[PDB]
DNA sequence: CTGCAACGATGCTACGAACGTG
DNA sequence: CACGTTCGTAGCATCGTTGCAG
């Protein structure tokens, strides 16, 4: 199966392989997507609510005016050149939606060495698939469980759209003697490596001194 | 024109981009196109709703969509969208199309022809070509130019009134120079307007050149 | 059995959109 | 607010493969 990808809201056109470009042709589009109760077979004329979702073109190609999470699925076209010539096209469909730029909330202006502080919560909105969130300090990324470094993360799918919202709250115990003017950022690393990662603006709180 | 050029094969779907438009509805944009089907200027909307919904329908993402092209679809296509706000963007498209005829055929081809005089060598025929395109003769693989040394071509173009397509015929006759190649090779080559594609050649003919009985 | 042709697949380049900077 | 740079996306071209005919 040939792997495929496109942006939600975008049109989609699947080429039927080995099939007459002009009608009438003998061919079958059978697919299973989030819009299907089972394998669904759409005909040359097609019919039903499916004409508003995915339709067969006079040239034998299947088409979707707007693709959505609901459409991730399997698409197979078994077609008849003339008779009995037969070739079968096979596609595997992943989709995606680029979320709004990441934001740190509840970020710290000041913080104190030797113990934990709330650095902030990096928050992404409107992503599919969900993807990952990471943090970095002055150019380099950070890992939990190492030298008092932890994370409280979560993911939530907006009911209407089906997209995702990821929260990541950063917390660290600053070494005493370190960088008093440190810069932190968060980055959204998408599930499908379609685009490069997106990074929040930095935060440069001031490390202060206990007694 | 500010119009960019687009060229498509007949029968295939085309999709035109609306520059700087909302990717999801609701969107404000309206297409304008004067072509074969449009009486003058047809304006199309994201809602569509006319008889054009089975022909030209604006997609949810703003682009213009044609299920399969046809000759009548040749013309200019423009869009006006508003990037909110109030940013506003344009598109100018010239769209032409084409069809490719079957491999040209030869007919009425001389069994053998004789020198020192004109001869009916035959006729090339190409059907289903668009735009019209042309038929060029080649002797041995080298061009044959009319008006020059007994070389003549009786030519026509017949447009199928229904398919709006072209049936082509080119009849070549030649006066061979006495004492020429006794087994010369003719071919015929159809060519279209742009490098929209390559050239199609007819299976050659290798007639026998017989000399005139002495007087 | 061999050659030629057509179709499909991949790679490349150019055009447009976005993002950041001054 | 504008200009300029970069990423992303889309189209054209190239090459290889498979099919078909001689």
From Swiss-Prot, chain B:
The keyword Ligase does not apply. Induction: Induced in T cells by antigen stimulation and by the S100B ligand. Induced in trophoblasts by DNA damage. Phosphorylated on its cytoplasmic domain by PKCzeta/PRKCZ upon ligand binding. Phosphorylated by ATM following DNA damage. GO terms for biological process: astrocyte activation; cell surface receptor signaling pathway; cellular response to amyloid-beta; glucose mediated signaling pathway; induction of positive chemotaxis; inflammatory response; learning or memory; microglial cell activation. It comes from the Eukaryota. It is found in: Cell membrane; Cell projection, Phagocytic cup; Early endosome; Nucleus. GO terms for molecular function: advanced glycation end-product receptor activity; amyloid-beta binding; DNA binding; histone binding; identical protein binding; laminin receptor activity; molecular adaptor activity; protein-containing complex binding. Residues 3-96 form the Ig-like V-type domain. Endothelial cells. Increased expression in pre-term labor and preeclampsia placentas compared to controls. Disulfide bonds join 18-79, 124-188. Residues 3-215 are extracellular. Glycans are attached at residues 5, 61. Keywords: Cell membrane, Cell projection, Disulfide bond, DNA damage, DNA repair, DNA replication, DNA-binding, Endosome, Glycoprotein, Immunoglobulin domain, Inflammatory response, Membrane, Nucleus, Phagocytosis, Phosphoprotein, Receptor, Repeat, RNA-binding, Secreted, Signal, Transmembrane, Transmembrane helix, Ubl conjugation. GO terms for cellular component: apical plasma membrane; cell junction; cell surface; early endosome; extracellular region; fibrillar center; nucleus; phagocytic cup. Its main location: membrane. It is a single-pass type I membrane protein. The keyword Secreted applies. Residues 104-201 form the Ig-like C2-type domain. Constitutive homodimer; disulfide-linked. Forms homooligomers. Interacts with S100A1 and APP. Interacts with S100B, S100A12 and S100A14. Interacts with TIRAP. Interacts with HMGB1. Interacts with LGP2; this interaction plays an important role in AGER-mediated pro-inflammatory responses and cytokine release. Interacts with double-strand break repair protein MRE11 which is a core component of the MRN complex. The interaction enhances MRE11 endonuclease activity and promotes DNA repair. Cell surface pattern recognition receptor that senses endogenous stress signals with a broad ligand repertoire including advanced glycation end products, S100 proteins, high-mobility group box 1 protein/HMGB1, amyloid beta/APP oligomers, nucleic acids, histones, phospholipids and glycosaminoglycans. Advanced glycosylation end products are nonenzymatically glycosylated proteins which accumulate in vascular tissue in aging and at an accelerated rate in diabetes. This is Advanced glycosylation end product-specific receptor. It comes from Homo sapiens (Human).
